[PDB]
Amino acid sequence: SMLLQKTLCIVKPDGVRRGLIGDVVSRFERVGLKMVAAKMLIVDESLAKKHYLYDDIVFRHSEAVWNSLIKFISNSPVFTFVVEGVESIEVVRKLCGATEPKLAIPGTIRGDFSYHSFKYSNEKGFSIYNVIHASANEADAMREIPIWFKDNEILNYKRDDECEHYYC
Amino acid sequence: SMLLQKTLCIVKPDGVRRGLIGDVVSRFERVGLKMVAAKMLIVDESLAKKHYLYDDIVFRHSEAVWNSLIKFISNSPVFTFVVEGVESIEVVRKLCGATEPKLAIPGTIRGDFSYHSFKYSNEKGFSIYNVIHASANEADAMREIPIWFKDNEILNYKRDDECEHYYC
Amino acid sequence: SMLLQKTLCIVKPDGVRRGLIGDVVSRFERVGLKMVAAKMLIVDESLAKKHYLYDDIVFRHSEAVWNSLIKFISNSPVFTFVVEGVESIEVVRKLCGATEPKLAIPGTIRGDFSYHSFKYSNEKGFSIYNVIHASANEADAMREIPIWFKDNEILNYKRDDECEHYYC
Amino acid sequence: SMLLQKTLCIVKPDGVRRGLIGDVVSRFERVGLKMVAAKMLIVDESLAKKHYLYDDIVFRHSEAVWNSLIKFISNSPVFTFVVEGVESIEVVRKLCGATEPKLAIPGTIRGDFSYHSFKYSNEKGFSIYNVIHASANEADAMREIPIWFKDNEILNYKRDDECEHYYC
Amino acid sequence: SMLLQKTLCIVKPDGVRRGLIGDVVSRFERVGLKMVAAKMLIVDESLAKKHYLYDDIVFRHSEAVWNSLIKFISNSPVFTFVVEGVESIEVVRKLCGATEPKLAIPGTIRGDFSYHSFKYSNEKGFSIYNVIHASANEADAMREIPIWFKDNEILNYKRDDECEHYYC
Amino acid sequence: SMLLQKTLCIVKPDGVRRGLIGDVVSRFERVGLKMVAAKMLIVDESLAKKHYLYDDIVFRHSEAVWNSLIKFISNSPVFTFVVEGVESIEVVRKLCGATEPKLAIPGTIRGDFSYHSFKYSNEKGFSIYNVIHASANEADAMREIPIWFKDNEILNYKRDDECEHYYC
Ligand SMILES: Nc1ncnc2c1ncn2[C@@H]1O[C@H](COP(=O)(O)OP(=O)(O)O)[C@@H](O)[C@H]1O
Ligand SMILES: Nc1ncnc2c1ncn2[C@@H]1O[C@H](COP(=O)(O)OP(=O)(O)O)[C@@H](O)[C@H]1O
Ligand SMILES: Nc1ncnc2c1ncn2[C@@H]1O[C@H](COP(=O)(O)OP(=O)(O)O)[C@@H](O)[C@H]1O
Numbered sequence A, B, C, D, E, F: 001s002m003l004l005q006k007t008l009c010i011v012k013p014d015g016v017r018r019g020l021i022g023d024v025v026s027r028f029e030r031v032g033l034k035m036v037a038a039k040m041l042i043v044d045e046s047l048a049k050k051h052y053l054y055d056d057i058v059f060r061h062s063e064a065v066w067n068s069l070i071k072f073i074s075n076s077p078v079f080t081f082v083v084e085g086v087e088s089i090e091v092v093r094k095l096c097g098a099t100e101p102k103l104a105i106p107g108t109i110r111g112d113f114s115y116h117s118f119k120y121s122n123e124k125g126f127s128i129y130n131v132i133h134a135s136a137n138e139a140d141a142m143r144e145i146p147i148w149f150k151d152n153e154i155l156n157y158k159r160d161d162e163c164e165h166y167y168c
């Protein structure tokens, strides 16, 4: 089925330094979404720049924004993983909540585990520290996954609750 | 008080096979709603057919949806229970979330524990598996309860927190 | 296999009145034990005196203990269920913890959810309120299950995680 | 920075009596908010009237509502505390959810832990019991804090995760 | 009843700075123990020295142990509270687990929330950071409570679950 | 310090297929232990038979046990990770609990998440399915880590709570 999608997720340095990795993974395992890849790395500036595209960010935010994003991620630990499921990209975004923790609804990853605002991040010259990245859409997922992951690092296996989600 | 309502709930076979009974019940106990009846059973087709009325499901959806529903429930295990409280029917509906798990809001039962879509269920020709059923309204709760429970299976007792919900 | 067992559990009136049914059920679902029967009822006197047999209780304890068990249970709400699994009788006992809440180890149901002591219950002349009953052994299990359930109320189905516990 | 605020919170007598203090405190600690003051007391009538202002509650509700607020809080236990964080007043309100438990959205403190309605509270003549109070705005927060806390009871320290919220 | 006891608990500066106040308080509320006093303060050196008595700590351990306890607690935030219940002193100790986190049993506060060893702290010259303090015995509890709380700060009220613990 | 240790952990295929990765990881983050490496892979035969060394398994158990272990792990998904901390090897083992789920104490990963017995696994000729592997001792950890990770996959960074565990 073409509705079966893979999405790229990153527990960002704030999530990692706060010990929130298990909490994050569980949110996705609990709804029925399937972890099919995972690795932990220090992000060098080179990879950071390959993940957050300069052209993409400055035409949708600003140059200050993109600079502080690279600052946030470069030479800092992350936990990156791929989630697979029925229309997973949209579902993952729903579970993450709004980009701005101040606005993110309770029950979501960002609404439950973070709170600070854009006004504050702007005022301080730092990036928003919002726990998780998730691919915005299908084109983003397709671009992002190979940036973090080799083909042979994406695993194929059955979760025990598969029939409840995919049907059998 | 007539504001005190009873609502019929079912943890569906997906919820049962996934080991989610306790999770579902705790959601209702935690808010202060009171369990006043419970039974576990294999649903045979006759009962499936009394609960999901042909005329209702076909008017609101289709015959195929009805067929898929009868197939999902029939000869599978459910945990059926009755919840009592102040305007409980509406509150229980809020706690469950939207019918379609893809769109069910995080924090709700269906939002936290399931995720697949109507589009995908149509593609495959199976019912949506959304963990739990709850009576939609007062007329439905009145019809549904006696189908599942005899009068003497509906219990009367006081929860220890009663004065906080019902007042004393 | 002879090792597959069924055991009788009761969430006692203290557990029910405190809104702890979901909590208790989750403990068993989470290790991989399977719920195969459930009912809620107000226990009348003869049922209480069937579950707690005068001769067993006087023998293992005393008459005063029997009387206070009957008082605690009779005319009060319980949620009764049967759990199935590999050597489930011993495993359920382990999860419950020691009879006396004061000494019950943290991590068990009794250790996490109750705390008062035999010394106090004896001083006050009431039963220990320790949240949950479970069959003490195989002979008790075989006696206790049909007191609470008809044969047709014991369910046969497959948990989605069956292969991890029973093997396939 | 001007965006750093303090806000007054009260676990109301219902929350205290229901043993929900820990739950309420964790919600705020978990998002990154900082507890900078805490005390538990029996509220006498005099203090209740300083907290819930007659003129303000009457204009926005009625005299009946105010009397029942005073009756609810007076000579009852509360756990009061102050929360500091970036735009904390708004963030704490989002976390508490709607005044009326019936409509409070799942995920919020009020949505997860209480459920009764305005209609029912009117019908019985008691205040709504919604677990928690939090200052509604900057002005209320500046009035309420000194009513509950002396200046030397507001603590100044660093949480270990400070740099994730305030930056460093 | 002579068995009703009050004990002094302190969430230590490690627990406070790691955002664990709510987690700790919940463990006590959940078993049925009652919070009857609470306050948050920065501990000055003289108070720290009334609580950790030189003669007691040197006789029980060493001068180095007393010194590192004073240094850990002094000028740092604590959340101090009093717990009331049936043999609460012994029960509270069971729930905290062994003094050394390395050996503290899973399920207890120290076991679940900390881990390092006496061996390590001795090497480094610091106190063990084991989250919480609780009175060792009845004499200690009598001595400790007035050091932290005035008599008029110890509250008298009923938990809604009181009849399940004290009986009614 | 000599007491700083790294230990190798594996969420075995049962844990992965059951959606337990988050749960396991949270146990370690929660005590203060630091995740310093992670990957997910399908284990090939040679890697399984390097992790589980024939001679060591035959001496401590038997050839049949070795065979059934290799069948369990080979061509199945795992989540492998390294945990760093003060005497982390012994601590991780405490948190895992007894090898046999039936006996593993409630509070531990194996005790809360699995339950079946050695007697049953031998009866059926399968390996015990106990959710997690962790290095038994320092020699084992030193041998095991490079089998699963390259030097450059082991991360060096500070957790926000570091000062509470390592001291600062
Ligand atoms: N379009 C659909 N496709 C597949 N299954 C459906 C569809 N609509 C409803 N269902 C299934 O039938 C049940 C009954 O439908 P309905 O009464 O509309 O929803 P709800 O149960 O939320 O009130 C749903 O809970 C769901 O399991
Ligand atoms: N119509 C009402 N009936 C009963 N109680 C009410 C009503 N409106 C408000 N209350 C109670 O009075 C408190 C103060 O009201 P208000 O300040 O308007 O809400 P909030 O506390 O959410 O800011 C509420 O928390 C609620 O407990
Ligand atoms: N008697 C047995 N029967 C089946 N499987 C076993 C047996 N003993 C051990 N195993 C499996 O092999 C793994 C390695 O065994 P061992 O090293 O003895 O335990 P541990 O994993 O606790 O170090 C175990 O974790 C378990 O999966």
Ligand code: VO4
Binding pocket: A099, A132, A133, A134, A135, A136
């Ligand atoms: O890193 V994000 O594109 O999910 O804000």
Ligand code: VO4
Binding pocket: C099, C132, C133, C134, C135, C136
């Ligand atoms: O109520 V019990 O027979 O488990 O002591």
Ligand code: VO4
Binding pocket: E099, E132, E133, E134, E135, E136
């Ligand atoms: O810090 V106290 O150890 O004596 O529980």
